[PDB]
Amino acid sequence: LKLKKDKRREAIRQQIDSNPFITDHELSDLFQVSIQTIRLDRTYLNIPELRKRIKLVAEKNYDQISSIEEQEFIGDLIQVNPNVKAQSILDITSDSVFHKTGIARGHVLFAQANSLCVALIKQPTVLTHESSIQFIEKVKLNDTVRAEARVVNQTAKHYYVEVKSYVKHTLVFKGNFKMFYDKR
Amino acid sequence: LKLKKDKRREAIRQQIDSNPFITDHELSDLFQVSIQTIRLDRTYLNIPELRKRIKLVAEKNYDQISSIEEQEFIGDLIQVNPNVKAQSILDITSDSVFHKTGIARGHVLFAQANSLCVALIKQPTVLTHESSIQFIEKVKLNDTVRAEARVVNQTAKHYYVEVKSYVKHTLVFKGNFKMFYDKR
Amino acid sequence: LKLKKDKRREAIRQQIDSNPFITDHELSDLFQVSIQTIRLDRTYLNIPELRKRIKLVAEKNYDQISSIEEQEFIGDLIQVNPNVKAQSILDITSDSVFHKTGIARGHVLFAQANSLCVALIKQPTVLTHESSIQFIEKVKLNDTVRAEARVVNQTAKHYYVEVKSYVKHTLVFKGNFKMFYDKR
Amino acid sequence: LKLKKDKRREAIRQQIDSNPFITDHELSDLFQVSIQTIRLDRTYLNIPELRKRIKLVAEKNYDQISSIEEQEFIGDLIQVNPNVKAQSILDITSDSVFHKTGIARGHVLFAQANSLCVALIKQPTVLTHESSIQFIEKVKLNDTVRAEARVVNQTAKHYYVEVKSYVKHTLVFKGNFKMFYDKR
Amino acid sequence: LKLKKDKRREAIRQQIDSNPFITDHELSDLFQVSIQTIRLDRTYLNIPELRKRIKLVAEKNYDQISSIEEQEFIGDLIQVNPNVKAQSILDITSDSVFHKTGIARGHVLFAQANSLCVALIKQPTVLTHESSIQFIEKVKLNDTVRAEARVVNQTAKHYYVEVKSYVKHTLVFKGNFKMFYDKR
Amino acid sequence: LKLKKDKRREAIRQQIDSNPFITDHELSDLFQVSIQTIRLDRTYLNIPELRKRIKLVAEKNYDQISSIEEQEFIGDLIQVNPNVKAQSILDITSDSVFHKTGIARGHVLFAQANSLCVALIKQPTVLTHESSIQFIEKVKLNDTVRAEARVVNQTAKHYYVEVKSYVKHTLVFKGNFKMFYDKR
Ligand SMILES: [Zn+2]
Ligand SMILES: [Zn+2]
Ligand SMILES: [Zn+2]
Ligand SMILES: [Zn+2]
Ligand SMILES: [Zn+2]
Ligand SMILES: [Zn+2]
Ligand SMILES: [Zn+2]
Ligand SMILES: [Zn+2]
Ligand SMILES: [Zn+2]
Ligand SMILES: [Zn+2]
Ligand SMILES: [Zn+2]
Ligand SMILES: [Zn+2]
Ligand SMILES: [Zn+2]
Ligand SMILES: [Zn+2]
Ligand SMILES: [Zn+2]
Ligand SMILES: [Zn+2]
Ligand SMILES: [Zn+2]
Ligand SMILES: [Zn+2]
Ligand SMILES: [Zn+2]
Ligand SMILES: [Zn+2]
Ligand SMILES: [Zn+2]
Ligand SMILES: [Zn+2]
Ligand SMILES: [Zn+2]
Ligand SMILES: [Zn+2]
Ligand SMILES: [Zn+2]
Ligand SMILES: [Zn+2]
Ligand SMILES: [Zn+2]
Ligand SMILES: [Zn+2]
Ligand SMILES: [Zn+2]
Ligand SMILES: [Zn+2]
């Protein structure tokens, strides 16, 4: 048997506090309850929908970055520790897919990744010098790609950044980035 | 001393017949004559401007390709030998540059290259699986990037394609692409 | 009395197999059941909504045509027998109506029809030479117009094509088209 | 020999007073003088370029019409005698041509014509009921099409309007329009 | 206890007849019944949604005004007594808000107000000469602002117009406008 | 008589060093020499055109401001002393004028002014509370409006800012702004 409405809702607040980015689908699977029930529950709880929460959190992050302007950034910058790590979320719309197939275009995922690497480095001048990438799974129209970047090495002239991207906890894309920086 | 008007113009026709894509700047340097003189000369000769000639030639090429639709293609497909080699030209407009610097965004050059590799392979299904790329020189607002792709290996399941890109005969970008294909 | 849920759903699959383009409204009228019930039923059946099915089928058709490029085509090409007959579907949006009245603009329906005639003829060069048309009923904002073209005569230099267009099986527009063609 | 600068310029003012829509090319042919000389002459004379003059005159005309809103009108309404005759000018841009050929799309010329017929009739409700049209010459990218409409018959319920369209005094398109009207 | 369905619906028709612009939220508060119940009720009653009714009424009003063109008007002109008073409604979309905060930009509310003052004056030439304005409350993304303009003085050369703007009967913006007019 | 080419050009560099925003028209009037001569001179001198220089200088200024995002700013921020004074330049395009007349819309000039006041104040939260404005001269299509803002009073809760706007050193618009600020 299932939780009483009240306890389901308490549990839903705890989940979202704990993961500000948890989806309604994830919440429905967790509590084994229709995706519509999740919506009514959030409404009752005064928790805004995922898009909004995502946009609220990201807005604060563009203040921490200096290499690229907010409106140039690809995706939503959900997390950033300058010079250490960062994450973005990007929805795949028809602009981003091949028209015959609905398969996401490679350069879109590369763009999300490259942008994130530029953004996480706290320098005036930050350019990508080299990159090698692997497209591990097809990404489809309407997917949401979470990219996660981290610095793996830092020399005097470069940062080496690894990016891994996911669609529902499935690794879809991996890349290595060699980033140049100077005090200018 | 310089060529008489008549002989300069004869020589200009021969050059363009010989390179349909030669620029007015290249023609001015060749004959050491203002870029405006080149224009008057072409007008007299009934040779259309570079943009037009480029668009006339490319139009015929989209007929030879099957992996990607014409209007999805990045740049102008100036040359194509299906399954062997191909070339595109792409102008760098403000859409393609970082706003602070006028430096072309990495994903734009990668997009030109990735598109070209997809286009040159004559299969129904063609996906990029892996890529490694080097950004050799900064590309600037208003540059024109010529990308040149060639197949270097072909196995039963993949084509390996090398792309090299230029701005006025200067190598600016290099990439290796691992492309998947099947009969579907 | 009405069909049990199970039998209604079986019957709904049979209908859609039989007419890939049947609407939810048509399905609701058939089974005398709310338009929302139809939606839940399709969801259960794993049958995508009308827009999608329409776009899946049409995508395959642009491969058969050569006179006009896919992205220039007006409406969705749902059916094509080159040089014989063809059909398109076109939604009437605010772009297509007079602003004071919501009445569809004449040139929009003519455009759907003219495009279809160009598309169905399998020649490199296909131009419309003459046309006579009758606007039989007002088409309104949000209507969907199904145009149906067929060749009625073929001489050495022309095809004569008749187009008839409908909104819910009501004839709204009729046209005769005199089409030129050559091997060029 | 040619006219002195002064007399050429006097003659140019007289021409434009006499035809507010005469082009610089027409003026150059008339006086056998480069198209650039015509420009310098107009500048000296304080006569604005063709586009402007066209837009100044047309602006006054939308006040006389009631069947269609100004911003819905196709082309520039250069002349109007409500219920009798009217004319528009329309530039053919890339939006209006087939992409492979630069040939103007049929529905564009039909749209100019149909709009003009709706505009010239001074009634609240004016709908096109029937039309037959002939595409007499190919219209190309960058052409300017002058459409000329006149009422040929008027019954109690309809106006019969003939439209003829030109590119440099060459008849390119002809149409007959059966227009419905009522007091509503 | 609450009204029977039938009587609620009768009462809802009377309300909308009486205020063509009453919202579903207002109707839900009145009858203490979910906003969704209001929707089902209107559907049953054949009363179109607020957006439509608003657009139907406003369409008739642009005929009465002469100083500014319909498509230039900011908001929907719901009410107009030329030279006396007028009202508009304007939705606040992301175009109209600061990006960090969702707060409506001042010039948007000023634009609604200034447009309304120009529109209500029945003269060929009508220009704003002076204005003083007070932003009384923050307007937020997705609010709907009702602006209400009235002439308070009229001299030989000017009209003095007061505008007051509201979001759910809360005064949010107030302005005084000094408007110039002549017979030209 | 006029300056030798060499001395004219020396003098032109000195002028632009001295006023980075001086126009070619201003330079032509100064040296009484065609606007085209000015262009050739700048080309020779390696001084970029006005648009570019303006965009280079402004780019550096958005770094100093915190109340409004760069891409939301109306016009180009050519000068800024946070909490003291600032200036913008704004071109008047067809988007900004009444369609019948080419006269700039009031809210456009108010927008330039209001944006500048928000931008110059170095606080997280900065809102306009009150404003009174005078439209002193008609601004026309293609004019360039220079707005100049300065703080005239500062209390604990507000800044009082005066804006004056010009087209070729002619005062066209004046405004007083009451701005709210807090540490949030
Ligand atoms: Zn998750
Ligand atoms: Zn699941
Ligand atoms: Zn397609
Ligand atoms: Zn892209
Ligand atoms: Zn490096
Ligand atoms: Zn070259
Ligand atoms: Zn050179
Ligand atoms: Zn910038
Ligand atoms: Zn891009
Ligand atoms: Zn592979
Ligand atoms: Zn049907
Ligand atoms: Zn029905
Ligand atoms: Zn309207
Ligand atoms: Zn159209
Ligand atoms: Zn023919
Ligand atoms: Zn003529
Ligand atoms: Zn000629
Ligand atoms: Zn094409
Ligand atoms: Zn069209
Ligand atoms: Zn009739
Ligand atoms: Zn109310
Ligand atoms: Zn309430
Ligand atoms: Zn922002
Ligand atoms: Zn605005
Ligand atoms: Zn005044
Ligand atoms: Zn100056
Ligand atoms: Zn001057
Ligand atoms: Zn107008
Ligand atoms: Zn505006
Ligand atoms: Zn205050």
Author numbering:
A (entry chain A), B (entry chain A), C (entry chain A), D (entry chain A), E (entry chain A), F (entry chain A): 6 to 189
Direct quotes from the study:
Like most transcriptional regulators in bacteria, FapR is a homodimeric repressor. Each protomer consists of a N-terminal DNA-binding domain (DBD) harboring a classical helix-turn-helix motif connected through a linker α-helix (αL) to a C-terminal effector-binding domain (EBD).
The crystal structure of full-length SaFapR in the absence of ligands has been obtained in two different crystal forms. Interestingly, in three out of four crystallographically independent protomers the repressor has the same non-productive quaternary arrangement as observed in the structure of malonyl-CoA-bound SaFapR, with helix αL bound to the lateral face of the EBD, strongly suggesting that this compact structure likely represents a conformation of the protein in solution. However, the helix-turn-helix motifs display high temperature factors or even partial disorder, and are engaged in extensive crystal contacts, suggesting the coexistence of alternative conformational states in solution characterized by flexible DBDs. Similarly to other homodimeric proteins studied by single-molecule or NMR relaxation approaches, our crystallographic studies suggest that the two conformational states of SaFapR (i.e. with EBD-bound or EBD-detached DBDs) can be populated in the ligand-free repressor species.
